[PDB]
Amino acid sequence: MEATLEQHLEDTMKNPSIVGVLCTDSQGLNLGCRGTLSDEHAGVISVLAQQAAKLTSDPTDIPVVCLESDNGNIMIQKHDGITVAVHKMAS
């Protein structure tokens, strides 16, 4: 695997339980997405991560946001400065 976001996004989608993935910067800029997660979700995902950050105070305690519904689970966490969201279909 080479160090491009594109290759990371493609590899992530090889996981059969993963139906979507989206990465943003800290202001909702859509860095890249696949599957169920697209441009329209970028802003919401970034706001969720930024708001979650305010319910803590480090040291670098990166707080994980998980949203659960009938349509599966979205897990949002920062990795190396980037906000990464993954949509998984469990059942």
Nearer to its own copies, 15 or 51 (CB): 51
Which DSSP category does 63 fall into?
P
Size of the site for its own copies (CB under 8 A): 21
Q: Is 66 in the site for its own copies (CB under 8 A)?
A: yes
Q: Is 78 helix (H, G, I), strand (E, B) or coil?
A: strand
Cα separation, 41 vs 65, in Å, equals 15
Q: What is the C-alpha separation between 2 and 43, in angstroms, rounded?
A: 28
Binding string, 25-54, against its own copies, x = CB under 8 A?
----------------x--x--xx--xx-x
Rounded least distance, CB 52 to its own copies, Å: 5
